[model samples]
Target: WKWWEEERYPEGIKWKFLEHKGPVFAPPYEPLPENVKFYYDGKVMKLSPKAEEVATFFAKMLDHEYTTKEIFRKNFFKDWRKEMTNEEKNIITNLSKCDFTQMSQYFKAQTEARKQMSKEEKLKIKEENEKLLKEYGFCIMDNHKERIANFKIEPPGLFRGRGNHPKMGMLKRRIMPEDIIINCSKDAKVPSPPPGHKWKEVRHDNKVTWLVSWTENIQGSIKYIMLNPSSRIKGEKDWQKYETARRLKKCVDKIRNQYREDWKSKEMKVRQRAVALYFIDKLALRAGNEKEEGETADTVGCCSLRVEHINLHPELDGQEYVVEFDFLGKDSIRYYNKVPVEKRVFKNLQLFMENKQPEDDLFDRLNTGILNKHLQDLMEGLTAKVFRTYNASITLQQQLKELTAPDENIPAKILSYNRANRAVAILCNHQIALGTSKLNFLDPRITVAWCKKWGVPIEKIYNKTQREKFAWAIDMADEDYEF
Candidate 1:
């Protein structure tokens, strides 16, 4: 029987649960009583569906949440306006008074125009995008001198606008020290100032900011924040190399083997041991589940796997094990995998769910911190994500060595490069269509030719605006193709 079957526990096991408390305060939610009317200019306005959802969500968090002022409005507005249509955006340039009020109207108009655009037209706009890497990127704040470094700009993702954001073209800009309040150790020293002026100290807490540091890209509406590469905070060396992945794989295998032998033990602890081992082996997931500071999306982890995110396929095709897992992970990327489980693990899951709802966490009894602390007793520096990194890197290196040919030319070498990249992409479940023109900027001739050969359009190759820029780079390299 399934672990969650009600009959498993006659009286039901009491699943002691813990509240998620965080290190910082979250924005408070405002309450809205049913049938209460909001008066605006003496007119009673009923709440819209969106407003109602917001109110209801907030109401659920009354005593726990507290909202803070949104930081970097200027940066947000600048990016927000870039996505405006030529006609709608012109209003911003011509307006005699330009403030958040007038800007808001322009945003509304742009939103309306976007709704009328077709998918092809939208793809065209993405192809033409050439925003600076620094503009929509972020730098890590390092320990040395409290400076930021290792500025990384993520590739653009599908726009999922929130709140009153009208223009779907506008994306979130890269974060900078000016945009974020740095909470650091009191003993930390201040970062070096940019060439000219000193920074304004906002508080004794060691936070500082430079009000206006914007630069326009050669082409594109968004401005980028220039960061100092020399800052230790931005250096790659700041990242500590922990070989946790390799160790976890070894440890998990040991635990699984041990549990297999102890499955006959009648003790509840023995059963619990078997279930935890199953989670580590079958899922290949990170053990750590950090608590959200405030009201956010409800996601789960290894011990926190939710029912809706997983499905038990008893007899799908010729498969013998219960298939499971479907959910978004870090950066909101979808993670979908299926694995056969041990009979004992399946039985324990049933035992765990006696009185719990499907939406509840499976391992309410365990967390990453607790698991890691236990692991430490066995071996030092053992944590959940380490297993992932170790597995990924080892798999990649193995595949690269196998696929790469020593005699291949640079063009052939690049093909091998793509093969290596494609392997990692596939493992991570990154799906990019062969005909997607978003990558045209990588090399118009090569990408276009490849797309045509694959029966996809040239436009698809340039679908992503950043890809268009890449096309030139790829084209140049193709012309000079060498071994």
Candidate 2:
């Protein structure tokens, strides 16, 4: 049943048939207005073409906090200096001595003067922009028009990211029409670059998923343009991912018991697989697709019955389901947690503990690779954690389908996850005091004042005051006032 391993594509092959339109040329540079002034050493200084262009990069970013960091200036200036002529370099030796205040203020004025548009107005603008993009943006692919991403290129800038990446302040070099490569079928009108310029090349090679390619000077990986997976072509990925684990619904009962039978096996290997699974059931183990190749069996993971690397607990204060674990796990890190288990699990732990040292392994016999094969057979496609995938999403969907209002966009059920985390927040804040508003604070009467809930039927859970108490549970608890 090794269906997936039947045969893979060519070994070094990245993918079959790549088609892409290449990188868009960054927008042409527009010189800043004459109103903006450049000052050096406390005086007005006119700059050379090269020095002024780089200076314009710094002028627009005055609103950003990046301008204040010492490292950012060092990094940006370090790169910008390479483009400066010897004459400009002599006069502008010190970056700190220069002031871009006038230029910064001019840029700020333009921003404040811009319009605050309505949603429809904003949407209309986006639609028009889309029209402009569609004209020259898409490429013919696999016998259809695929609206390509990065079709209309963004303008160049000396953009920097937060805190600082190594290249954060480095000057973002500009791109000319020459850098753009048009990847498409031999037929059809490709967007012509310009009357005077020729494209680097018009190409028709389609063995990979790219439409365009160009190498950047930095990092040396050719920049590219390709389709984004969500639009016009590949949106089904999300729905399929969500529904894949739901199939676990049908056969989980069958497989769970099969593992249970193996839990009691006379063979050490079977017992090891069973315990490895048991750990996964606890610890909220997410369903894994595959694992690394290794010879280490009996490696205590969420699945291992026992391992030289793992240990557990048998008791706690009236701890019916008490369990504890500690070990070195993924990323060469220490793993630790204490959890409540069930009667069935504790007894099994007790059974495995018999005739074995407290620190000894639960499974001295099995490995994940063997256990993985067993899991693969449980259901085709997949499972998530010990619990099926999308079950959280699925459970919320079923629980709230009839409970919450039907109008919200994020799905009313998603909003409900907030309450569980809210309970933990309240638990942490239970120690509050308000003596001046003492009566206001303790008047459970005023708090528990609501008589009924909107859609929730009253007779089922609380009396009127209890409803009031829970109603105010905005700080009020649930239908818990009188009770």
Candidate 3:
């Protein structure tokens, strides 16, 4: 019997099962392959034994079933330290004597000191920092004429933040791969794996390399072999359209207007349904919930509305019509609202639902893919998500302009910044409770008075710590001040 059909048999029934066909394989217990060779300034070097052991542990785990639950510091520490050579262990111990965490702390202090510098000194420091990032932040691989994206050393995360982190006990540092798959072009010669058995394979594609696996101390996850930032495949530009939000607002408004006029036209199916889709686009509502092929009984979306999820009330509040919508959305959150709509759209919805039961789809003819494809024709690169991003950004910018004051201090500036962030948060459906609680409660009026005293731009103050420090003087000064 199939796994799902096992319940049909008795508790202790005997049954014959099919035999396996594949060859029996024995599990290998060898240490991980040392596949990485770092080429620095015309010299080739190997990673330290400690680093190699760390990489091996992660690679083995990825090829096995042991998850976060099976791995722990006691076993990991024992296994990792055991593999390290005597000299490397002594070096690591010596390095541990002087706390390296202080390095980041010192850097932060230096940054804070720079805030009191003259304009010339500040400019010099900024220039120097930019030069450093541009120089050491990239690595060259093949001669494909591609520019590797800049390498970013992420800030050290909060030490107490727990999860599948490789650097839980020790300070988390940057990563370099020891095992990699080199892909060469079909016509080009393939490079050999690094000495020893560290590498998995070297392909002739030349365009990309796959580092199959690496181990980290993080809990319950596979250690993946990630491409270096300098690799061509990893250097592809991100799909962000910087001006998308601005452009979508203009186009979406036009689409809304055109759809409203269509509803009043004398056409049949097309005109009536066009109005409903217009609301979905303008409001940035979800594509509506739908029942998976053979899953739950819930119905949603333009055509998939269930009877209990919506109610039509005519002459209830002296308005021509009203529709109350209440239903669970993705992640099972309840979405409840009541809004008045044009009589035309209301009549069309009812007509569309005439022959269907409560479980049937209201916009049965539509789906997210179909609607997005239709939008693509209306405007290039248009999709449902574009409207959401545009509306959210525009709304935040407007709220920021309105709430920000010219003479506020840094604290006040931060307050305004938070208010702007909160406004966007609200539009995105973020909610907070009225009173203090463990999770949902929000603290109100905490920074408003503090901000007003310092003559800061609350928005600037509300920025992240690094941003606040970088733009410190501007954040504390009046709005009229410019760099």
Candidate 4:
């Protein structure tokens, strides 16, 4: 049955019934054989099995630059000491004295051996993996069997955060049955844990869609085992997100005019919010949620921008009122742009920067919460992020109209389509990950309809995985469809 045609569950309810086999835990650690020895201070030293497991994590990473980073080494040593026995802790006091070269060599050899394994052995391993997927990959949600997004638990290792993260070398402790909380219908068949283990908790909360959850050690963030994007529930959610953005389109002009008026507001907070909203709309910038100090890589969005992150110029390169932006954005990607803005926006920025240090917040009077609350008064379900979605989608539709040639062949039409998508991606500052804008921000229906109208194969635009995720859009959007 098509879930889009089916009436949704009540506002808070996600599903009436759910059942699933629990995640496949990581393979148990195997102790190194006696021949593979660890050396400390040029002498062989036997370590406790537990301590050895933690050491192997570091050894595997020895050839990487992370091992050379001072912060990574400091964090790794501190966490590694916690896992050491009293005697080992005392003897292995100095991190530099310890030698992991032998351990590293052993691991490298094992990998080479793995690569040289007989074809039959490789096939056996592949079959075993498939067998595991067959057992734990799918779940019954409501009346349909849906594919689980991630059926295997993340294996324990050193935290390798992106963009010089503070917690990079910290040990990610192995997850046990005691750590996981299972969620399912009360009458559904409950998943069993390993032989002697009991789950942390069994919950029947239908308000949330997650079937399994555990708090990750790094950043203490909650991670979930949920349905794949191809699932009906996820597809429905995707459709609704675009609908919110579409609704924003209707009131966007009024909102812009209101914000423009607010730029001359007597209140400092109102002026800041107006400028920030202007940036969010014009640049497709993220809301810039506040992160705890020293918790993550330093990154700024529109609201979290600091005085030093931007440089205001009255005139540059023959352009009036140019503002140059330079800062790390999400995932530590650098965003650098120079755009000419209205005189009012330039004046407002100058006012905000006066008598403030470089490190000081540009919008000390505002944040995402305050900005979003203001947006909510203008439109229902409005948030700073909805602007990104709305702007990106609108840009694609407009760009496609401007770029696509009516008589172009399929290949040329596809090139024009890519140019259209790329324009939105550039506006949104989706630098590193090419698919980030297409997958999450832009409405898929726009592309689907553009493909249909241009007589271009959908396969040319989306890969197999992407096609599955946007199956609903492909199915419902015709040539005449508009975002």
Candidate 5:
């Protein structure tokens, strides 16, 4: 459905009504058959059911790189010991002495067996999964039957942190009915808890859009079950984000000039905000929320950057006023860029770094919240993140206009399009795994128009899944459309 054409609910009210069957819980753990055994110090040791279950979690990932990391092994063993019986804990003192090879082999064999299963068996499994999806993967919201994203609760397993995380290998506890809170209208057909179990609560708050939520044990963060990208709730949010970016385009030059002038302001906070905004706009950086120490992997964006994260140079190689940024960004992807800036920005950076220690924040007088509030006054609904979308879309639009040739064939034009996209991706610090975020950042109308103008199939830029996600843009935008 073209939800963009429909009227939105009043502010803070996501839907008039909501109803859905609760999330599909993770399957109960099945014990390994007696044939598979765990060995401790060259002796076969029978572990208790609880301990065995945890052991199997490790066994399944024996060949993975996570198993080899020191912190991963330490954290795993510490958590695994908690589930062990007293006797088992006493005997299995050393993780290195315990061998999970037999269990690993069993799992590997089972995987291969599945791969070689009969066609009928495979088809039956596929059909069963489809049935599960049909029952649990959709919800009624307002007047639409929206598809739910992540309806199946994430199964319990070892926490896999992307970078060297402090909580790596920690047990992600299984979410039970007791842990979940369901959200729906009071008059709607609310989902019942499984069997005898009861929900934590059933809330009728329309202020939030999540259908279900539960606190995750690993990071103590709330995990939500929200509508899929194609759903009206998500699509509406996506549309609003692009609309805000487009709005920025109208007054962006004024904002830029204001920030540039603020670089010379007498107040310390103003200069910090201006310089930070400069990096956010010029480099297409994230707002960089502050992370609790020892909770997550060490990653920094524009505002989170430390004094050590960047180096200021009056002259570098041959370029004057060069600023060198080197830090781990989102997903632990290292962002290393050297760019020469105007004299004011270079001087401001030098001043910001003057009295700060290497570990001190580069933008000590500013943060994402303060900067975003400033942006809000400049443009309604403006935030530091809006700059990312605006810069990315603008770059894509400009690059397409500059790169495309009238005489070039379809394949050549497509290559040029991808080249332009890669430029935007680089600016956004999207080093790898650019699928979903790419779709979210770039204005779909821009790409749609470019494809229509060039006589190129949309499939060349976006897969069927992406095409579905941007259905509204595809339907609305024509050859003459601009970002």
Candidate 6:
């Protein structure tokens, strides 16, 4: 049931009943087959059980690029040796001569081959997860099977982080049943373990929900095991987010005019902040915080962007005031935009560039904290990310206007719609439209527009989830409406 139906949660109490299931785990790792040969300095080396286990970890990466770094390799090799028996450790001294390539090459094939089944595989796992969700995820609170948080405990999770990756070749640690805390009702059937083992801990409190909490050994931060709040949550929140951005029609002019006015402000910091704000609005940048560790990816959106993130050209091949951006965002992914700005912003960028390191902050006077602090002063309802949502929706609105037509094919419309999103995303860090979000986010006008001139059981593209989300977009957006 939606939480909206309730009067506010009574003071601080979440609910009377609370429950969840532990994460899916598999039998301990398996080893390579007889056909596979792991070589140590170019010869056969059958692995010790422990060493073989560690070797399996070697294949997935910080990514090959990061893995090749000295710090990543040193730390990885050092820890790898700890897993090796004294003989293997002594025998396998350096990683360079040891060829994991055989295993690596095979895994690449197996990985690609497994890619499709990997979906059905994950779905079956999700089926099992939903079983747990149905069985344990619900608690009849005062006679209703209300859903509470503690999502599928510790999912098949391994940090899929971008921005700055500090932990290369290192993710999961020795987390065992010893680390879980199972919260349930006073009389709920508690999850049992292997014969003769006891549950980690159980309690009757239901004011909050957390499947378990333990700080990562290295990162020193406790983690909650839920996923991005459900798509329903995403839809609702994005509605608010996109609405805030859409509301900025008035705000953009006023804000832009004010900032442009301040482009000539007395304080150097004021000029820099205004220019940075312009770039953030222009390029979908993040309202960032200084990374606590190499926590996020080394990549970033424009505002917290370093001088290294851009190459300013008062004059490029033919265009004046063209600034080219080439920086790793989300680390592995890179983007380049030769953005042409007015001469004023271009001239100010030179002022920002003077006496700065390639790695130094171009907007030192601006950070997510300071900049968002400014948005708060300008608008009560607006938040830092308003512009990104603003641009994304406005772009979608444009796509709806242009792409909705009688003669277009389905995938093309879907593709065209994704192209619209991609246009927005390219302004940020974007990607693949193969057939997912259209299966999810494409507006009904596009879908109905597709079918109006075409055919279906309405069966090919729009899945049930699509109908539910786009159903709203459908009725609202006639062939005649904006995004």
Candidate 4 TM-score versus the reference:
0.98
Task: List candidate 2 segments past 4 Å from native.
Answer: 1-24, 116-131, 162-164, 195-202, 205-207, 215-224, 228-232, 236-240, 243-483
What Cα-based lDDT does every candidate model obtain? Answer: 0.42, 0.52, 0.45, 0.91, 0.89, 0.62
The digit string of per-residue lDDT tens for model 6 on 1-483 reads: 443233544544645654445543344566788787788888899988767666766754424576677656666777778778898888999988777777777778788877767677879988987887776554444435445355443432233345346665553555556565565676665666545555556666656445445556556777654322332233444444545665785678899888887788889788878888887777766564465546545765555677888888878788889989887654447777898987888888888888988888887877776677778789866655677656665666666557655486666555555566666555545554324334333334544554433443344545675555455444444443433
Q: State TM-scores per candidate.
A: 0.46, 0.52, 0.45, 0.98, 0.97, 0.73
lDDT computed for candidate 4: 0.91
Q: Compared with the true structure, what per-residue lDDT tens digits does model 4 show for residues 145-241? A: 8999998999999998889798989999999999999999999999999999999999999999999999998789998999999988899888999
Residue-level lDDT of model 3, residues 1-483, one tens digit each, is: 112112323323212111111111122333323433322233443436445535333433332233233224433444444456776455544211222222234435556887677999878988986785455333233322322232332222111223333333332322332333333344433334323533344444322232233333323223433333222233221112324445666676788877777776675445535755765654545556444542322335543456556677774667767777786654444567776778877776676557777766566565667666767787888766566556555665555567877786656666676676666555444443211110111111222233444444345444443232223222333333211
lDDT of 2 by residue, 266-309 (tens): 77677756666765543434222233333111123444433333
TM-score of 2: 0.52
- State model 1's lDDT: 0.42
Candidate 5 accuracy as TM-score: 0.97
Q: Model 2: how large is the Cα RMSD against the reference?
A: 14.7
Most accurate candidate by TM-score: 4
Each prediction's number of clashing residue pairs? 35, 31, 38, 0, 0, 8
lDDT tens per residue, model 5, 1-483: 788788988889888899999999998988889989999999998889879988899999999988998989999999999988888888999799999999999999999999899999989998998998899999999888888988999898899988979999988878999999999998899899999899999999999999999999989899999988998888888988899999999999999999999999999899999999998889877888898999999999888899998888899899999999898988898989888998999998889898779999989878889999999999999998898889888988999999998999998998898788888877777764455346778999998999999998898888888888998898899899998
Q: What's the lDDT for residue 335 in model 1?
A: 73
